[PDB]
Nucleic acid binder design. Structure first.
Lengths: 185, 141, 25, 55, 120
RNA sequence: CACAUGUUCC
RNA sequence: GAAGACGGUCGAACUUGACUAUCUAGAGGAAGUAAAAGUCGUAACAAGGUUUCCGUAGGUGAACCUGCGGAAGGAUCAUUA
RNA sequence: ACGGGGAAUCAGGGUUCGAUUCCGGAGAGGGAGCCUGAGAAACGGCUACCACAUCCAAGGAAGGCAGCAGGCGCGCAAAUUACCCACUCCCGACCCGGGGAGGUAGUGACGAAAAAUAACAAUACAGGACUCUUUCGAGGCCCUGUAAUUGGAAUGAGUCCACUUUAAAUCCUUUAACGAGGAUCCAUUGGAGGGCAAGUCUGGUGCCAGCAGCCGCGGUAAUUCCAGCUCCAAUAGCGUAUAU
């Protein structure tokens, strides 16, 4: 009897067919356009879409006016609008089925760095996450898979400790300066 | 089903309990006699002592001399014709050396080209046969 | 091979496997 | 006979594996792949060339 | 090992066919056509009389270690024709009733040199 | 009235 | 109030005997399957040269043969007042 | 074959697993018998027989890791003879004493969550929208890509202190110093005949060695063996075996 978790859930699902051309192209279009690191996080985002879509599908099988459908329906639509996936103008349980895989792909923080125009590239955008160069609500985030909500969209900016922001200049400038005055006397 | 009574669940249970025995893949695992003729005994691998290197000839026009090994089991005492997997690896395996034999993959059936063999060697003397063929690990003499 | 004499050979050999057994028992 | 073991592997003439520039790993391996699958291809009539095709 | 090598390269019980095809079919049934061997001979009959060649029972002596058969048998000499010693091998037959010139060792034939006629 | 058999890398 | 004894009880274990389970030696006999392209002869597939087949008996190197009763999966769905 | 909650798989239905931290049962070599106590047929309590086994002065005496570690053996198969009662709690006459229950580290590609192995610009070059030109070409108001080409800019592996963390630590996070241009600080594992994404590349091999789960390839111009080059899938994982 030792107190620990032992709770594991795999966040992804490998596809049934591993070697078909059709599925191979679509995910390649999703990696290159959104700057992903493997094919796993493609199905990982496709797995959490399969969780929400199934949770939406069984609610339709429960008939209307049911409080469980009324509560868990409105509880699910509460979170979809708070993270910038579904607009206020389409708040209904029928719309979750028409929600597609690229829709969550906007709400990755890495896209928001190439959306707000503070990155030269979407692939340069991930490095600004990796080098602790940007912060959200006075909190630096070293992980690109942070799912930004609709509320902090205007709070995305450079970190406080960053040469590309309001912080100390980096090591390359501190190295190109020591020979900039050490070579001049 | 064929008998569709309201309280015929016993007759419907006995048949899928009786006729289940006529299933070939079922009767192999739910009767230990197959586990008797199994040299391993439900194991993924087995260790044994090599005593000779046999040459077993092919059958079909894909005819060649397959380089096999007659291994003697060191947990039950059986004698098994293993198979040296890779090309020109019969020189790596030496005589009276412990080997890790395994199933071939078809699980108890002669696998095409080689007759009457279900078993291949993966390790010798705690050294893999991939590493020897790749030369990354050698036999310490 | 006919399925008729292959039954017959399996009947003369069957009567042998009993007749060599009864005297031993 | 078991004297012919390793016949070809000894007599296959060696080729020194020549030095070549290492490929960029990680997501950049997919960044370069995505390039030469969508953004650089021109509409060219004729049969589609294989990724290793040479005749 | 040397004895059965003779019975593969030089012996065949009943020669079904005797023609050019039969020479071209017996020679790849034994493994003699890789590469196609230039010429070869095959004896017919029973083995005890072939075994009788090592002594004076049905054998006279001939140069160093060779022996002529006293009574003759049937032989088949198949000549490879074509400047490629690689298959497909093309042979032409010759029927006949000739003697044998074998070089037997330990009582067992291993090498048959020539198939001759008796005397002119 | 009788008439059995086959050699096959391609 | 101890040692001890008498009786009673639960009762391990041991000798012996029976029953049962599993695995294993066996001269020899008898099958099976596979490796070759061996010997013998054609049984089947065309009316496969005596149509094939089923049950049952007896025989014969081997296929198989024959008797008796079937059957078409037969070479006739039919041949005449 | 310890049962159950349950786990793995799944459209629906089920199939299989559940020695394994929760409850309960059962037992501390094998069985039998008991003492004491509210509560035991108790075994880190006794008394026998049976097996194994320790020291002797040979008269005797003593033993029970299916407790924490650890050792052999068995094996295809499994960690350190570590630190501490601070947390969790329990026990006692008890604020204090004690607890290998437990907690903390160590080994640890069982396994799960996250996540590096680069980013940009200029030029030389291929190319796409415009106008002139019936083409050639062109500037590029606008790009796309490549090229041991050049150029700085930015980081963390790691060295490293300090605090922090904690019972004391370690690691995580924090702070100073250094710290990459072929960022040589260099990502593999399987395949490239079909099934199945991916050369009719090149040489060696010649029904040989071998490959391949299946079909099938090798008999001298091998799209299947062996090498190199290139290419394909997955990516710190992947193949293989066996179970379902």
């Amino acid at each position: 009897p030792v107190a620990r978790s032992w709770v594991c859930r795999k966040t992804y699902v490998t596809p049934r067919r591993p070697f078909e051309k059709s599925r191979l192209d679509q995910e390649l279009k999703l990696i290159g356009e959104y700057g992903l690191r493997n094919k796993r996080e493609v199905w990982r985002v496709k797995f959490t879409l399969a969780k929400i879509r199934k949770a939406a599908r069984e609610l339709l099988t429960l008939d209307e006016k049911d409080p469980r459908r009324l509560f868990e329906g409105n509880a699910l639509l509460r979170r979809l609008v708070r993270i910038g996936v579904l607009d206020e103008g389409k708040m209904k349980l029928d719309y979750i089925l028409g929600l597609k895989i690229e829709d969550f792909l906007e709400r990755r923080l890495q896209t928001q760095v190439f959306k707000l125009g503070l990155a030269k590239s979407i692939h340069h955008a991930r490095v600004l996450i990796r080098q602790r160069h940007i912060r959200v609500r006075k909190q630096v985030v070293n992980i690109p898979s942070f799912i930004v909500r609709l509320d902090s969209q205007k709070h995305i900016d450079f970190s406080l400790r960053s040469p590309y922001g309001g912080g100390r200049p980096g090591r390359v400038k501190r190295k190109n300066a020591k020979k900039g005055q050490g070579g001049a006397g | 089903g064929k008998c569709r009574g309201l309280r015929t669940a016993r007759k419907l249970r006995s048949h899928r309990r009786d006729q289940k025995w006529h299933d070939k893949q079922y009767k192999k695992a739910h009767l230990g006699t197959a586990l008797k003729a199994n040299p391993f005994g439900g194991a993924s691998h087995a260790k044994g002592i090599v005593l000779e290197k046999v040459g077993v000839e092919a059958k079909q026009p894909n005819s060649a001399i397959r380089k096999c090994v007659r291994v003697q089991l060191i947990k039950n005492g059986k004698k098994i014709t293993a198979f040296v997997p890779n090309d020109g690896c019969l020189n790596f395996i030496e005589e009276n050396d412990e080997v890790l034999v395994a199933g071939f993959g078809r699980k108890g059936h002669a696998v095409g080209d080689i007759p009457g063999v279900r078993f291949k060697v993966v390790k010798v003397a705690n050294v893999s046969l991939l590493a020897l063929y790749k030369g990354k690990k050698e036999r310490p003499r | 091979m006919r399925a008729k004499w292959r039954k017959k050979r399996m009947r003369r050999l069957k009567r042998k496997r009993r007749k060599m057994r009864q005297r031993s028992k | 006979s078991l004297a012919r073991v390793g016949k070809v592997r000894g007599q296959t003439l060696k080729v020194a594996k020549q030095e070549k520039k290492k490929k960029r790993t990680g997501r950049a391996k997919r960044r370069m792949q995505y390039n030469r699958r969508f953004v650089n291809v021109v509409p060219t009539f004729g049969k589609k060339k294989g990724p290793n095709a040479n005749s | 090992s040397r004895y059965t090598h003779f019975l593969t390269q030089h012996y065949d019980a009943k020669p079904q066919g005797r023609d050019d095809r039969y020479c071209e079919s017996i020679m790849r049934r034994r493994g003699l056509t890789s590469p196609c061997k230039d010429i070869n001979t095959f004896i017919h009959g029973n083995k005890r009389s072939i075994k009788a060649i090592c002594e004076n029972k049905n054998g006279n002596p001939h140069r160093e270690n060779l022996r002529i058969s006293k009574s003759s048998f049937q032989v088949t000499t198949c000549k490879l024709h074509g400047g490629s010693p690689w298959p497909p091998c093309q042979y032409r037959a010759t029927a006949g009733f000739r003697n044998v010139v074998v070089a037997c060792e330990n009582g067992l034939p291993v090498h048959l040199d020539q198939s001759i006629f008796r005397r002119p």
